[PDB]
Design an enzyme around this catalytic site. Structure first.
Site, PDB file in Angstrom:
ATOM      1  N   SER A 145       0.859  -1.202   0.000  1.00 21.65           N
ATOM      2  CA  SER A 145       0.000   0.000   0.000  1.00 21.65           C
ATOM      3  C   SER A 145       0.887   1.242   0.000  1.00 21.65           C
ATOM      4  O   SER A 145       1.720   1.374  -0.911  1.00 21.65           O
ATOM      5  CB  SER A 145      -1.044  -0.112   1.108  1.00 21.65           C
ATOM      6  OG  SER A 145      -1.653  -1.389   1.130  1.00 21.65           O
ATOM      7  N   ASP A 245      -7.893  -2.472  -7.686  1.00 19.36           N
ATOM      8  CA  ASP A 245      -7.503  -2.247  -6.298  1.00 19.36           C
ATOM      9  C   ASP A 245      -8.515  -1.350  -5.581  1.00 19.36           C
ATOM     10  O   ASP A 245      -8.957  -0.327  -6.116  1.00 19.36           O
ATOM     11  CB  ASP A 245      -6.116  -1.604  -6.281  1.00 19.36           C
ATOM     12  CG  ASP A 245      -5.562  -1.421  -4.883  1.00 19.36           C
ATOM     13  OD1 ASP A 245      -4.928  -2.355  -4.360  1.00 19.36           O
ATOM     14  OD2 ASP A 245      -5.750  -0.330  -4.309  1.00 19.36           O
ATOM     15  N   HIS A 289      -8.382  -5.381  -1.275  1.00 20.28           N
ATOM     16  CA  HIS A 289      -7.375  -4.630  -0.532  1.00 20.28           C
ATOM     17  C   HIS A 289      -6.412  -5.542   0.224  1.00 20.28           C
ATOM     18  O   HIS A 289      -5.658  -5.057   1.076  1.00 20.28           O
ATOM     19  CB  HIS A 289      -8.020  -3.613   0.424  1.00 20.28           C
ATOM     20  CG  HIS A 289      -8.852  -4.233   1.505  1.00 20.28           C
ATOM     21  ND1 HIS A 289     -10.213  -4.032   1.599  1.00 20.28           N
ATOM     22  CD2 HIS A 289      -8.519  -5.037   2.542  1.00 20.28           C
ATOM     23  CE1 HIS A 289     -10.682  -4.690   2.644  1.00 20.28           C
ATOM     24  NE2 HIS A 289      -9.675  -5.311   3.233  1.00 20.28           N
TER      25      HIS A 289
HETATM   26  O1  AYR Z   1      -2.042   2.653   2.622  1.00 21.43           O
HETATM   27  C1  AYR Z   1      -2.988   2.367   1.972  1.00 21.43           C
HETATM   28  C2  AYR Z   1      -3.127   3.000   0.603  1.00 21.43           C
HETATM   29  C3  AYR Z   1      -2.378   4.063   0.447  1.00 21.43           C
HETATM   30  C4  AYR Z   1      -2.361   4.806  -0.873  1.00 21.43           C
HETATM   31  C5  AYR Z   1      -1.422   5.711  -1.003  1.00 21.43           C
HETATM   32  C6  AYR Z   1      -1.364   6.441  -2.326  1.00 21.43           C
HETATM   33  C7  AYR Z   1      -2.555   6.764  -2.970  1.00 21.43           C
HETATM   34  C8  AYR Z   1      -2.512   7.420  -4.190  1.00 21.43           C
HETATM   35  C9  AYR Z   1      -1.257   7.738  -4.758  1.00 21.43           C
HETATM   36  C10 AYR Z   1      -0.094   7.401  -4.119  1.00 21.43           C
HETATM   37  C11 AYR Z   1      -0.128   6.735  -2.877  1.00 21.43           C
HETATM   38  O2  AYR Z   1       0.980   7.834  -4.920  1.00 21.43           O
HETATM   39  C12 AYR Z   1       0.422   8.014  -6.195  1.00 21.43           C
HETATM   40  O3  AYR Z   1      -0.911   8.382  -5.965  1.00 21.43           O
HETATM   41  N1  AYR Z   1      -3.960   1.398   2.433  1.00 21.43           N
HETATM   42  C13 AYR Z   1      -5.137   1.009   1.575  1.00 21.43           C
HETATM   43  C14 AYR Z   1      -5.819  -0.340   1.843  1.00 21.43           C
HETATM   44  C15 AYR Z   1      -5.230  -1.108   2.955  1.00 21.43           C
HETATM   45  C16 AYR Z   1      -5.020  -0.215   4.104  1.00 21.43           C
HETATM   46  C17 AYR Z   1      -3.862   0.722   3.771  1.00 21.43           C
END
Ligand code: AYR
Ligand code: NAG
Length: 343
Positions: A145, A245, A289
């Site tokens: 993530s 996703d 996820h």
């Molecule tokens: O940490 C996350 C997701 C984080 C996303 C982080 C993120 C979102 C969009 C972006 C990026 C990074 O760089 C380019 O554009 N989780 C989602 C599902 C599980 C729990 C944690």
């Protein structure tokens, strides 16, 4: 179990100034090291970081961390659960900087919070060299993530650090899980491009040097998107990404009629297109996820090959292979058209 070590350099801190750290389980005799970056979104201004501090404090502070954690999935030491690297030295690096692992700024009279994700990775590597990493053959920097995006941002810097410190024989590689996002149009319409643009300024965020030189000042947010930063990287990187996703769909404001059907099908096709020239990749047609540190990570297959097998074939390729593929991208166009998707 993996045991907690707080960083000896206590100036390398979580958001609230408490020391950052890592959890470690050593495997004497193994020269493989797995360093895993935790995920958990991010925050980009005083107001939303204050809210995160109230109800997500473990992601901003080490004050309440437990003394041990259990390694699961790719971090498991049992061959039944981890056919790939069960005998490796295992490291879990908690995410406590809220900066997608990009920050290099300390708390001060002008800064309520410290954003030090990029320095945390460097300090963990430095302190591990005295605990056995000096003898490694392979260092795999993995993450899920926000931690998967963190791998793309930091793998070449780890390689450069070890070279400059005098360890040119350690082969640095990356494994980015669920961190390959698209800067696409939302289904209905703060989008990631704008939030990251603000975050970079708030965090003093840093990006890989070759990507920075392409996009130049003010445009470094582009380097947070896998399909743009990946071609600039020198270290080998294996990419794991669900075609549908859930975090991508969340930022796209998707929560079925013709307009939404076409939107979802086009998203899968776009993601597949961005992986066409990524030789080591695993991209199942699932809405999920779920991440690679889950106990049942072995169950999903693309074209009859599981992720632990694909990673083993990747290891062999870095010494095509008969019956041992490394490029595994689903071609079917709707979530769960692959029968092995997580339930
Ligand atoms: O940490 C996350 C997701 C984080 C996303 C982080 C993120 C979102 C969009 C972006 C990026 C990074 O760089 C380019 O554009 N989780 C989602 C599902 C599980 C729990 C944690
Ligand atoms: C501690 O970390 C800071 C930030 O990375 C660095 O400037 C300093 O040199 C480090 N000190 C030691 C002794 O490692």
């Amino acid at each position: 179990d993996l045991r907690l070590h707080l960083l000896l350099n206590t100036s390398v801190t979580c958001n609230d100034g408490s020391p950052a750290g890592y959890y470690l389980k050593e495997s004497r005799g193994s020269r493989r090291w797995l360093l895993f970056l935790e995920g958990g979104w991010y925050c980009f201004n005083r107001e939303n970081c204050d809210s995160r501090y109230d109800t997500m404090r473990r992601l901003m502070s080490s004050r309440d961390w437990p003394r041990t954690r259990t390694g699961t999935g790719i971090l498991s030491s049992q061959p039944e659960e981890n056919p790939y690297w069960w005998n490796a030295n295992m490291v879990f690096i908690p995410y406590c900087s809220s900066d997608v692992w990009s920050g290099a700024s300390s708390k001060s009279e002008k800064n309520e919070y410290a954003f030090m994700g990029a320095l945390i990775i460097q300090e963990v590597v430095r302190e591990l060299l005295g605990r056995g990493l000096s003898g490694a053959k392979v260092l795999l920097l993995a993450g899920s993530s926000a931690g998967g995006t963190g791998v793309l941002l930091n793998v070449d810097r780890v390689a450069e650090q070890l070279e400059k410190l005098g360890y040119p024989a350690i082969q640095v590689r990356g494994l980015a899980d669920s961190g390959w996002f698209l800067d696409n149009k939302q289904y209905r319409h703060c989008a990631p491009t704008e939030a990251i643009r603000r975050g970079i300024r708030y965090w003093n965020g840093v990006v890989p040097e070759r990507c920075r030189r392409q996009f130049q000042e003010g445009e470094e947010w582009n380097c947070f998107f896998g399909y743009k930063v990946y071609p600039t990287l020198r270290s080998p990187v294996f990419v794991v990404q669900w075609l549908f996703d859930e975090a991508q769909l969340t930022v796209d404001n998707v929560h079925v009629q013709e307009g939404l059907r076409l939107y979802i099908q086009n998203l899968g096709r776009e993601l597949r297109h961005t992986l066409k020239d990524v030789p080591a990749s695993f991209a199942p047609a699932c809405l999920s996820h779920e991440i690679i540190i889950r106990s049942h990570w072995t169950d999903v297959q693309v074209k009859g090959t599981s992720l632990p097998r694909a990673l083993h074939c990747w290891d062999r390729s870095l010494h095509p292979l008969k019956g041992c593929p490394v490029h595994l991208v689903d071609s079917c166009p709707w979530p769960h058209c692959n029968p092995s998707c997580p339930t």
